[PDB]
Design a protein around this ligand. Structure first.
Ligand SMILES: O[C@@H]1[C@@H](O)[C@H](O[C@@H]2CO[C@@H](O[C@@H]3CO[C@@H](O)[C@H](O)[C@H]3O)[C@H](O)[C@H]2O)OC[C@H]1O
Length: 324
């Protein structure tokens, strides 16, 4: 059971930006405590998995939008906005995309993979536009996800192998043509550490935007840890924001590195407080902050963990009170 009388999390940030959460379609029933927590504290939703490529087109031409639509319906019912995650990634994408259909032992050509990407992106965006119309809660999409490797080079996924470096520009082009009302984002992790990957994201977006690619913003996943440096996060936000794009904190959670002790929870609270003070200070750039999971018990991180503001019993943690 949840705490019904404590402050609604997102309301505390009404003058800064919406506060969202990533959800599972199986946790949306009115009597489900996770759903109650979702509707109470957030005014933005994201599909943790239901809108990924494999979740939308498991086999070629066979689109499965039921779970995604269930989340969209829920968002509409609770007056929540949504982020679309994600049109392209190297994980949770079916092998068929990259295979020659007449000889699955061979790879698809650059033209065939591009056509498939175009069809996927266009069908996905057209689905939400045609089914929901003006009521579509999705305000933007992570057009490409995690396209950089640890060293800042372009990740050598099958997309890069088969098409080449311009597959990124093509994805944005296809999304923009399908629905110009959508804000288009390039999303990634570790770009908040002000290291080589932050610089690489900055260089890539600067290059593409200067070439006319319709990139509207950068999503900083923010899968931080109990040892993350606030100064580096601030420097990263400033650097990326200098490109004239929106910044959204898209998959916020805190890896405790196995230490879920009471002392660690207090340290977590202090860090989350500093983090949100930073976000508020940077409100002229940040247009959304989304947590990757409703509560600790449903977090994607391996156990033991305590990454969010609500614990495994769905109760507000010290971090929640520090921020509110
Ligand atoms: O942007 C990335 C996120 O999308 C990513 O989210 C996690 C992706 O893996 C999910 O776990 C899979 C769910 O589907 C099952 O069939 C698989 O067996 C699981 O591995 C997890 O639920 C998401 O939270 O996190 C990393 C980000 O870079």
């Amino acid at each position: 059971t949840i705490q019904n009388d404590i402050p609604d999390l997102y309301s505390v940030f009404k003058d800064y930006f919406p506060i969202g959460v990533a959800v599972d379609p199986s946790r949306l029933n009115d009597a489900d405590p996770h759903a109650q927590l979702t509707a109470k504290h957030f005014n933005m939703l994201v599909a943790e998995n239901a809108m990924k490529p494999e979740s939308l087109q498991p086999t070629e031409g066979n689109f499965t939008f039921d779970n995604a639509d269930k989340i969209v319906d829920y968002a509409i019912a609770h007056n929540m906005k949504m982020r679309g995650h994600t049109l392209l990634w190297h994980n949770q994408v079916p092998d068929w995309f990259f295979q020659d259909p007449s000889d699955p032992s061979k790879p698809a050509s650059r033209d065939l993979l591009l056509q498939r990407l175009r069809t996927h992106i266009t069908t996905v965006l057209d689905h939400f536009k045609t089914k929901y119309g003006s009521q579509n809660p999705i305000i933007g999409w992570d057009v490409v996800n995690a396209v950089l490797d640890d060293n800042g080079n372009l990740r050598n996924s099958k997309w890069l192998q088969i098409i080449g470096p311009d597959y990124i520009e093509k994805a944005f082009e296809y999304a923009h043509e399908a629905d110009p009302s959508m804000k288009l984002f390039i999303n990634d992790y570790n770009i908040e550490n002000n290291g080589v990957k932050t610089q690489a994201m900055y260089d890539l977006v600067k290059k593409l935007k200067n070439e006319g690619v319709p990139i509207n913003g950068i999503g900083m996943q923010m899968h931080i840890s109990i040892n993350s440096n606030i100064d580096n996060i601030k420097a990263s936000i400033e650097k990326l924001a200098s490109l004239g794009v929106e910044i959204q904190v898209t998959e916020l959670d805190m890896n405790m590195n196995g230490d879920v002790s009471n002392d660690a929870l207090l340290k977590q609270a202090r860090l989350y407080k500093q983090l949100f003070d930073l976000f508020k200070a940077e409100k002229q750039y940040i247009t959304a902050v989304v947590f990757w999971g409703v509560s600790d018990d449903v977090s994607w991180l391996s156990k033991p963990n305590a990454p969010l503001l609500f614990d495994s019993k769905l109760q507000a943690k010290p971090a929640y009170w520090a921020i509110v």
